[PDB]
Amino acid sequence: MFEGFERRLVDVGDVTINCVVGGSGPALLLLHGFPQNLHMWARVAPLLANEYTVVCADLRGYGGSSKPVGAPDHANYSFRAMASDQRELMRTLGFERFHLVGHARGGRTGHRMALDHPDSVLSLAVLDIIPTYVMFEEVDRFVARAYWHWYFLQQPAPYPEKVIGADPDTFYEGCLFGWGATGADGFDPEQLEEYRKQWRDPAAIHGSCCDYRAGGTIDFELDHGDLGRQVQCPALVFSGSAGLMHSLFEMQVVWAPRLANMRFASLPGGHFFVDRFPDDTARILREFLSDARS
Amino acid sequence: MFEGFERRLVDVGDVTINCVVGGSGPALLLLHGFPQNLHMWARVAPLLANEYTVVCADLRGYGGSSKPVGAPDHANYSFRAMASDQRELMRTLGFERFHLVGHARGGRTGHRMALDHPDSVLSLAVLDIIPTYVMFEEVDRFVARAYWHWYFLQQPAPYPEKVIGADPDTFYEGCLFGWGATGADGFDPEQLEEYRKQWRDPAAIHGSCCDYRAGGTIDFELDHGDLGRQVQCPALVFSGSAGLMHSLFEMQVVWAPRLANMRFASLPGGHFFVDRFPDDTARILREFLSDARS
Numbered sequence A, B: 001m002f003e004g005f006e007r008r009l010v011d012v013g014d015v016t017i018n019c020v021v022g023g024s025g026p027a028l029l030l031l032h033g034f035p036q037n038l039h040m041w042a043r044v045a046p047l048l049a050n051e052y053t054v055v056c057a058d059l060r061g062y063g064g065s066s067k068p069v070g071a072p073d074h075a076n077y078s079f080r081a082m083a084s085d086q087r088e089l090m091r092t093l094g095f096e097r098f099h100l101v102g103h104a105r106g107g108r109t110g111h112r113m114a115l116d117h118p119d120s121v122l123s124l125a126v127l128d129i130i131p132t133y134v135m136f137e138e139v140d141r142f143v144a145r146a147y148w149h150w151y152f153l154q155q156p157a158p159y160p161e162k163v164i165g166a167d168p169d170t171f172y173e174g175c176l177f178g179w180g181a182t183g184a185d186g187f188d189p190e191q192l193e194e195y196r197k198q199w200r201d202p203a204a205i206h207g208s209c210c211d212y213r214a215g216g217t218i219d220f221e222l223d224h225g226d227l228g229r230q231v232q233c234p235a236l237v238f239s240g241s242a243g244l245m246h247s248l249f250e251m252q253v254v255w256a257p258r259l260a261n262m263r264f265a266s267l268p269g270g271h272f273f274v275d276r277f278p279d280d281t282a283r284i285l286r287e288f289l290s291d292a293r294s
């Protein structure tokens, strides 16, 4: 995987970020979600590398990046903290400005990055997410049942860590196949094994739980403070039309108040559609990035 | 435990209900909750047996009772079905009418029994519960986080069964100590060991998951259909004032429209207050039952 890409472990302050870098042209940062890592982009990234300098990075708590113990207030796993790591990564790699594509947790990281440092983000694509604020503020019995993990993963350490730790493969496969609504046949064996390595790492189990703990506290509060602000750069809301969130919310309705320049796309998959549709994901991203640059 | 009580396995139709029966006087049915069984009453029941014929029974899916495989629509684990078992148990024991005290799932079973067959229920005590309808209809980010299990346990079989099955002690201890807000020191070791036997029983893991699956579907729908009906018999709403539900809702406000003759009481414990305060639980129930009879 990632043939010809350079593998780098980059110190960005108090953490180290694992990434791969390949291609040439404008910078494009690809950020993964949960329970995955930069390997979700193993097929997409080489496709886009003919036109972009593609950086795929692991979020703090995930993959090969640092996974500090979560602070009592979860602040070291906020999307603000996660975004700072990634912006600093790009700067260290020589990129003051870059296009940003984020799935799930990476999309939330991107939204926060664009709010905190608008000048760094040339365009923003958010893949299969409803805004964090909306997820919580507009929760009902259907939303809570569909994305049950938003509540389980908030339970205080070490409870979810120990429950998950007893059988990580069962737990996380249920994330892919259940709330993730993406059938097993849609996953490439090589990429799936990279996810499995992380699933079995207790430090990653903890880091990802802390991400969710922050999600329901510090992130919710920061997002609340920013209500009414719109990201100004070109944005793409790119969903899985066979996923749970595409059907309980209208993507266009929840994102319009947050994005001044919004385009939409979807693929007929679940939350983990990038795993099943890498060529079509690259196609849609390529078109959007071209539009954004025009 | 339950010295002097008769132990009975009673066929009530398509299931067998496990129970213990002691004392003399009017019938008093005590129904447990989750993740417990009739042993939650091991200290309360002998105290009340000087004035009541006390029957402590295991709900279907729990303890020593039948635990059928859940139907696709969960209807065989509805509170209606659970109530029918217990009403028939009492009839077989010679009681057409009886006082009913239910904690949690048993309280919900009791409420449904009083709605379906009001003539059978002489008085109703509901211990540390907010009505199912309210739990779901009025869910918000706080309620969903507090009682996260209401969503996790609804996930389709066999997913929660397998997650729990990998380490039932960790999982269920987290129910007692976490959302249950009842510290370990409040549990009698003898009672705890009987809970633990059930925790490790795969048939009980499944049965209790099905209870929650019905809880969010058939039970919610049946309850919705009965909105505006009031239970007419004397009723007691009896909460743990140090528990999560007592503080997230006003017990008296959520129950008042549902109960025409309502009294309220509390003890300074969490959801599992009966474990820590058996003598005081018996005292409060005894006073209520005396008042109800008058």
Ligand SMILES: [Mg+2]
Binding pocket: A077, A078, A079, A210, A211, A212, A214, A215, A219
């Ligand atoms: Mg976060």
Ligand SMILES: [Mg+2]
Binding pocket: B077, B078, B079, B210, B211, B212, B214, B215, B219
């Ligand atoms: Mg039920």
